[PDB]
Amino acid sequence: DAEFRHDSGYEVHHQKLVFFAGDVGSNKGAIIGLMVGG
Amino acid sequence: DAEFRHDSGYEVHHQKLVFFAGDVGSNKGAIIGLMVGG
Amino acid sequence: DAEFRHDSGYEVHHQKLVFFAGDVGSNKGAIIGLMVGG
Amino acid sequence: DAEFRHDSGYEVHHQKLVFFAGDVGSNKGAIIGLMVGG
Amino acid sequence: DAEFRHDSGYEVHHQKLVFFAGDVGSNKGAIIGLMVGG
Amino acid sequence: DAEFRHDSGYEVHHQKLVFFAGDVGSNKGAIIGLMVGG
Amino acid sequence: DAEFRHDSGYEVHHQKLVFFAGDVGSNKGAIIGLMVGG
Amino acid sequence: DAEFRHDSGYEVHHQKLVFFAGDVGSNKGAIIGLMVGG
Amino acid sequence: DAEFRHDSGYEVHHQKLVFFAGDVGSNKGAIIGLMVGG
Amino acid sequence: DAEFRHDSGYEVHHQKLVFFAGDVGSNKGAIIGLMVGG
């Protein structure tokens, strides 16, 4: 007579002027805010 | 008669002018705010 | 008759002008705020 | 006259009988290999 | 006269009997190999 | 008749003008605030 | 006349009978190999 | 009839103009505030 | 005339019967190999 | 005319029957090999 209960909790996010909001599992590419050449 | 209860807690985030908000599992790429060349 | 209870706690974050807010499991890439060459 | 060169390197992975192979940016859910109740 | 070159590298993966092969950006759901109740 | 209770505590963070706010499990890459060459 | 060169190195991984192979940026959920109740 | 209770305590952090706020498990890479060459 | 060169080195990992192989940036959840109740 | 060269060195790891192989930046959760109650 087992009982398995899981709750992921309450998440509230307030964000302003955020370039990258989020979780990246794996990153091998390029993440650049601004690129100026020449 | 076991009882398994898990709670991930309450998360509140307030962020302003944040380039990268988030959790990266693994990072092998490039994360640059600004790139100026020449 | 065991009881397993886990709570991840209450997390409140207030951040302003933060380049990188977050937890990195493993970092082998480059994390640079600003790159100027030439 | 700047030169920006980035290389993410050579990655070779050999895995056998691995439940979870991969990078998780953020984890708030449940990751259980086996669940038995009652 | 800037030059921007990015290479994500060579990735070779050999996997056998792997339940979950891949990168998860964010996980709030349930990932269970086997569930047995009653 | 055992009882297992775990609480991760209350975490409050106030941060302003912080380049890198977060916990790094392992760091082999480069973390530079500003790079000027030439 | 600056030159920016980054290399993430050579990574070789050989793993057998590994429950969780990978880097987790942030973990607030439950990671259990086996759960038995009742 | 054992009782296991763990509490991680109350953590309050106030930080301003902090380059690196956080705990590093292992560091083999470079952490430099400012790099000027030439 | 500056030259910036970074190398993350050569990493070889051989692992057998390892529950958790990987780097965790921050851990607030539960990581248990085996849970038996009742 | 400066030259910046960084090398993270050669890392070879051989591990067998290791519960937790890896570097944890910050730990506030529970890491238990085996939990038996009742």
Author numbering:
A (entry chain I), B (entry chain G), C (entry chain E), D (entry chain H), E (entry chain J), F (entry chain C), ...: 1 to 38
Task: List sentences from the manuscript.
Amyloid plaques composed of Aβ fibrils are a hallmark of Alzheimer’s disease (AD). Mutations identified in familial forms of AD (FAD) indicate a causal role for the amyloid precursor protein (APP) and presenilin (PSEN1/PSEN2) genes, which encode the precursor of Aβ and the ɣ-secretase enzyme that catalyses the final step of Aβ peptide production, respectively. ɣ-Secretase produces Aβ peptides that vary in length, of which Aβ1-40 and Aβ1-42 are most abundant. To determine the molecular architecture of pathology within fresh, intact tissue we developed a cryoCLEM workflow that we applied to 11-14 month-old AppNL-G-F mice. These animals have a humanised mouse App gene containing three familial Alzheimer’s disease mutations (Swedish, Beyruthian, and Arctic). In contrast, the Artic mutation is situated within the Aβ peptide coding sequence (App E693G, Aβ E22G) and is thought to increase the generation of Aβ protofibrils.
To rule out the possibility that MX04 altered the structure of the in-tissue fibrils, we also determined the structure of fibrils purified from MX04-injected AppNL-G-F mice using single particle cryoEM, revealing a structure that was indistinguishable from unlabelled β-amyloid. The ordered core of each protofilament contains residues 1-38, compared to residues 9–42 in type I and II wild-type Aβ1-4213. In both type I and II fibrils formed from wild-type Aβ1-42, E22 is surface exposed. Alignment of available Aβ1-42 structures from post-mortem human AD brains, and the two distinct Aβ amyloid structures from AppNL-F and AppNL-G-F mice, indicated that residues 20-36 form a very similar structure in each fibril (1.35 Å and 1.31 Å Cα RMSD AppNL-G-F with Type I and Type II fibrils, respectively). This conserved structural motif adopts different positions with respect to the fibril axis and the interface between symmetry-related protofilaments, giving rise to the different amyloid structures observed.
